[PDB]
Amino acid sequence: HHGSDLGKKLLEAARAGQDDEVRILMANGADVNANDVYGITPLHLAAYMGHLEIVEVLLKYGVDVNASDQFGNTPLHLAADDGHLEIVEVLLKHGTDVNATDTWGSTPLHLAAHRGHLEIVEVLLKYGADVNAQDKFGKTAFDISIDNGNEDLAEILQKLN
Amino acid sequence: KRIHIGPGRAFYTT
């Protein structure tokens, strides 16, 4: 997934949010699962940065939506982290593992709870997010919401205990 | 500045 000139260009185009360039690179055979030395792929970058159209293009080309970088981050983690609701929605509709864990034990639900992303929490729950999953520090999404004083978010996760 | 809540975030902004 390295050594290809087009793969490096695809990573750069995703990182820079250059929609047309991503499209043309994929139309001309670029590796949809290209990655850098950290295991970071174009989908990871587009998901973290909020490039929805680029996410959709990569999905159309059969990208591995469950790819993890060397830190255990999946695209769903990163979109939940930075608050990109529409990206969260399209990834889940394409079958991403809703309960994947990074190297700190966080699922995407934990990250959305840290951030207070209410609508993202609701979509993750709709797709089967595990409210009982504990991170490496024993905390559930509910525990996080209580620690951060997010009364709105605790209102939802309370009902599911 | 941004507060990171997961690992490796520095490598997403180079």
Author numbering:
A (entry chain A): 9 to 169
B (entry chain B): 5 to 18
Give the authors' words.
Since 63_B7 also bound well to the linear peptide, it was additionally crystallized in complex with linear V3-crown peptide (MN). Despite this observation, the different V3-crown mimetics, as well as linear V3-crown peptide, were able to adopt the Post-CCR5-V3 conformation when in complex with 63_B7 and bnD.2. It should be noted that 63_B7 and bnD.2 were selected using different panning targets (V3-IY mimetic and CD4-bound gp120, respectively), thus highlighting again that a common transient conformation of the V3 must exist. Five shared resistance mutations highlighted the similarity between bnD.2 and 63_B7. These positions (T257, K282, P470, M475, W479) localize outside V3 near the interface of the gp120 inner and outer domains and involve residues of the CD4 binding site and/or layer 3, a structural element previously implicated in Env conformational transitions.
The V3 loop of the HIV-1 envelope (Env) protein elicits a vigorous, but largely non-neutralizing antibody response directed to the V3-crown, whereas rare broadly neutralizing antibodies (bnAbs) target the V3-base. Challenging this view, we present V3-crown directed broadly neutralizing Designed Ankyrin Repeat Proteins (bnDs) matching the breadth of V3-base bnAbs. While most bnAbs target prefusion Env, V3-crown bnDs bind open Env conformations triggered by CD4 engagement. BnDs achieve breadth by focusing on highly conserved residues that are accessible in two distinct V3 conformations, one of which resembles CCR5-bound V3.
